[PDB]
From Swiss-Prot, chains A, B:
It is found in: Cell inner membrane. The chain holds residues 2 to 67 of 276 of the full protein. The lineage of its organism: Bacteria, Pseudomonadati, Pseudomonadota, Gammaproteobacteria, Enterobacterales. This is Rhomboid protease GlpG. It comes from Escherichia coli (strain K12). Keywords: Cell inner membrane, Cell membrane, Hydrolase, Membrane, Protease, Serine protease, Transmembrane, Transmembrane helix. One of its GO terms (biological process) is proteolysis.
Length: 66, 66
């Protein structure tokens, strides 16, 4: 059964950790989503072009060292 | 417009940070959810009792020092 949900993963984990000390084992389904929004529609094509390059290698130095 | 979504918030933020260096400002709608699951239904009432106490003060020393 699904007990509850928390926005803050550290708060959820504190509850889970505490319950484990009482001998009750809980698990977390952490569903993570960061939606990226652009206000200025005229930049959309430019952003999508860069996104294609980024997805090919998000760890490229151009992104790490920005 | 919504450009895309990423599970990893640091990956999303790297993209946003890079785009800012190109003069394009993006924002993130970060929707955070940690669902807490219990496999053993016989413990449900006990967990819900503790959850009520936890919600009243998640920062109580009993949770911090577990």
């Amino acid at each position: 059964l699904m007990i509850t949900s928390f926005a803050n993963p550290r708060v959820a984990q504190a509850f889970v950790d505490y319950m484990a000390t009482q001998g009750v084992i809980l698990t977390i389904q952490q569903h993570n989503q960061s939606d990226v929004w652009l206000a200025d529609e005229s930049q959309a094509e430019r952003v999508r072009a860069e996104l294609a390059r980024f997805l090919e290698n998000p760890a490229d130095p151009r992104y790490l060292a920005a």
